[PDB]
Amino acid sequence: GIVQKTATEQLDYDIDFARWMPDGDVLQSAGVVITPDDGTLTSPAYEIDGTVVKVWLAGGTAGASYNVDVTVATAAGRIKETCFKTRVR
Amino acid sequence: GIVQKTATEQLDYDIDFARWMPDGDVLQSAGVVITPDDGTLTSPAYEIDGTVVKVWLAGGTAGASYNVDVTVATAAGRIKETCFKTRVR
Amino acid sequence: GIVQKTATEQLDYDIDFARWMPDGDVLQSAGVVITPDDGTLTSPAYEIDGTVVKVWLAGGTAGASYNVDVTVATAAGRIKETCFKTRVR
Amino acid sequence: GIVQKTATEQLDYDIDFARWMPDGDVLQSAGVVITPDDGTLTSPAYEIDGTVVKVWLAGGTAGASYNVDVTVATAAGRIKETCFKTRVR
Amino acid sequence: AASTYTENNILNALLRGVAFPLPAKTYVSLHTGDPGVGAGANEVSLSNWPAYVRREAEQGGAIGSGWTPAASGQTSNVNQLTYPANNGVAAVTVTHYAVFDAPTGGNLLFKAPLTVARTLQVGDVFVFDVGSLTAQ
Amino acid sequence: AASTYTENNILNALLRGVAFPLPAKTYVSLHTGDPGVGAGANEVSLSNWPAYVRREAEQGGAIGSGWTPAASGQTSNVNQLTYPANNGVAAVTVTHYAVFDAPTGGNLLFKAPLTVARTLQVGDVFVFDVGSLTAQ
Numbered sequence: 001g002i003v004q005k006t007a008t009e010q011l012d013y014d015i016d017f018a019r020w021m022p023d024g025d026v027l028q029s030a031g032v033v034i035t036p037d038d039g040t041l042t043s044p045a046y047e048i049d050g051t052v053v054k055v056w057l058a059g060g061t062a063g064a065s066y067n068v069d070v071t072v073a074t075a076a077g078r079i080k081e082t083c084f085k086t087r088v089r
Numbered sequence: 090g091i092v093q094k095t096a097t098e099q100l101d102y103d104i105d106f107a108r109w110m111p112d113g114d115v116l117q118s119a120g121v122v123i124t125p126d127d128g129t130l131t132s133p134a135y136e137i138d139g140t141v142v143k144v145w146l147a148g149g150t151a152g153a154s155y156n157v158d159v160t161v162a163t164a165a166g167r168i169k170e171t172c173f174k175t176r177v178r
Numbered sequence: 179g180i181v182q183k184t185a186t187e188q189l190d191y192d193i194d195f196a197r198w199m200p201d202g203d204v205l206q207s208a209g210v211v212i213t214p215d216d217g218t219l220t221s222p223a224y225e226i227d228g229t230v231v232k233v234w235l236a237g238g239t240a241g242a243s244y245n246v247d248v249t250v251a252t253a254a255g256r257i258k259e260t261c262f263k264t265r266v267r
Numbered sequence: 268g269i270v271q272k273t274a275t276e277q278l279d280y281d282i283d284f285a286r287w288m289p290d291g292d293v294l295q296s297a298g299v300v301i302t303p304d305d306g307t308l309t310s311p312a313y314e315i316d317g318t319v320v321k322v323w324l325a326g327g328t329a330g331a332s333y334n335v336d337v338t339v340a341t342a343a344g345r346i347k348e349t350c351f352k353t354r355v356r
Numbered sequence: 357a358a359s360t361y362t363e364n365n366i367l368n369a370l371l372r373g374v375a376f377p378l379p380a381k382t383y384v385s386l387h388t389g390d391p392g393v394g395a396g397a398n399e400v401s402l403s404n405w406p407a408y409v410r411r412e413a414e415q416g417g418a419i420g421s422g423w424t425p426a427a428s429g430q431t432s433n434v435n436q437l438t439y440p441a442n443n444g445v446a447a448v449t450v451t452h453y454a455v456f457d458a459p460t461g462g463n464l465l466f467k468a469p470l471t472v473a474r475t476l477q478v479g480d481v482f483v484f485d486v487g488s489l490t491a492q
Numbered sequence: 493a494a495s496t497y498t499e500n501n502i503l504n505a506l507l508r509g510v511a512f513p514l515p516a517k518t519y520v521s522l523h524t525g526d527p528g529v530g531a532g533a534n535e536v537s538l539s540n541w542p543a544y545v546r547r548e549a550e551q552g553g554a555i556g557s558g559w560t561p562a563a564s565g566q567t568s569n570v571n572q573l574t575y576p577a578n579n580g581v582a583a584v585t586v587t588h589y590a591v592f593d594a595p596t597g598g599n600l601l602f603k604a605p606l607t608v609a610r611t612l613q614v615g616d617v618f619v620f621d622v623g624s625l626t627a628q
Binding site for chain 6: 363
Binding site: 022071076077078079080081 | 096097098099100101
């Protein structure tokens with residue numbers, strides 16, 4: 001439940017799992033889904049490093065509020081979903 | 090006696106019985122029944138460890154609040170049931 | 179966005195991106211583009227030093243509101259833009 | 268960015284650039300242009316010493332407030348102009 | 357934004373039937389002013405930038421890998437172009453780049469000004485990242 | 493004002509190093525509608541001109557007689573073009589001419605508008621006077 005601002009650029013926009021991560025487990029997998037995948041807002045790449053998922057955002061035009069969803073796995077098997085909206089300038 | 094939120098993810102969803110346990114009894118058996126009889130919100134398996142019933146929920150479609158009740162057997166012969174409502178996002 | 183004043187001169191007009199750089203990002207390439215582009219208000223060159231982009235502006239017309247935006251790249255792939263408005267006197 | 272009073276007298280009329288000088292640049296060239304194009308309020312000569320442009324004013328007839336603007340070149344390539352209005356008594 | 361050499365060659369190839377030259381390798385250079393757009397250019401930055409060697413495109417591939425397969429036009433620099441660091445003396449201002457067949461001389465394929473006027477300081481790289489130098 | 497085939501091939505020849513396919517002979521043709529830019533044209537005029545063979549340029553020479561050799565670009569029809577006369581039916585409106593590699597299909601080299609839209613009545617020759625159909 002967070003909102004981001006972009007116009008035409010590729011931006012870092014990292015998310016951390018310090019609070020939610022239950023106990024001493026390590027993140028795997030991870031994925032990105034953007035509702036207007038049809039629209040120019042593509043997802044360039046996704047990266048994991050030390051329990052922080054690095055999601056790059058390509059960006060798009062206009063004033064539409066694009067939705068990006070991140071789904072992450074865990075070693076024990078718990079699956080956490082987090083969705084946040086990136087509002088393009 | 091609480092509420093859970095999920096969309097499609099799998100979670101541990103622990104339940105603790107330290108409050109109710111009369112004296113050192115070893116929990117056995119244990120079972121969960123789901124109000125939606127649809128087969129939605131299936132529960133894959135439950136782990137009974139240290140008076141904590143670890144009941145997992147695969148998840149369910151749509152936005153109907155699915156209810157699951159947990160029944161436990163104890164060595165002395167005491168049986169108790171607890172029902173909590175899980176809301177699928 | 180900031181407000182800028184010039185009449186017929188060229189000056190430095192440094193623009194700062196350092197606060198955004200996390201660690202070891204080397205600002206490279208980068209380009210500045212103006213909307214009322216042709217003739218009128220032209221950037222003779224820009225310097226890069228210490229992540230501080232210094233965009234020189236040759237000078238606008240009589241009293242029109244000219245804005246120009248600087249785009250900066252990084253070898254990490256991140257892109258960022260800031261548009262500062264220059265009010266020619 | 269100030270105002271001067273004179274009747275027929277010749278004055279030093281110094282201008283100081285310590286406030287604007289970025290870093291130790293040596294002022295060169297320097298020039299002044301007079302708004303009355305009459306040739307009235309001629310400026311005999313200017314001395315450039317220690318980032319202080321010593322621009323002299325011979326003076327002008329009547330009571331029209333003559334305006335003169337000073338343009339300076341710098342070694343790094345920065346050019347700035349300052350205009351101040353001189354009132355002949 | 358095309359040289360006299362490329363125009364004559366392509367017009368001959370398309371209409372008259374003359375054979376078309378095949379450049380062995382593609383070299384990119386920098387220009388302080390606009391190229392004269394004819395054969396040769398005015399001028400390359402040399403003796404102020406002692407390291408100015410034209411970074412050969414597709415440094416690894418033999419041929420046909422420097423530029424992406426054109427589709428309804430469009431071309432792009434496949435391999436990142438990194439220029440040697442400036443040795444010293446005076447700063448040089450770079451606005452126009454030229455596509456050259458040979459390391460020196462050897463015709464001028466494209467002449468296109470950079471969208472932004474840029475100068476090179478005492479120590480800098482002036483990189484051309486992937487997807488730059490797009491030409492239709 | 494150039495075709496997708498020709499622009500793709502010019503870019504490939506200039507950048508990739510792909511050998512340039514060469515038109516063995518250049519054929520000029522007319523179309524009532526605007527040609528696409530792609531392979532083929534939209535549309536060729538037949539069943540209204542039973543005599544509409546795509547009149548070849550460079551009637552005499554085998555190769556290289558189609559156009560004057562390009563100097564700083566530009567070419568012109570060394571040879572006059574005299575199209576077969578209109579045969580009948582009704583008057584046919586002609587607005588666009590296209591250069592063709594083959595008598596039928598076989599890519600579309602150039603697609604360019606006529607300076608003026610000439611409409612042809614029942615019996616007309618529609619000649620190209622020497623000095624038209626310049627290409628850059």
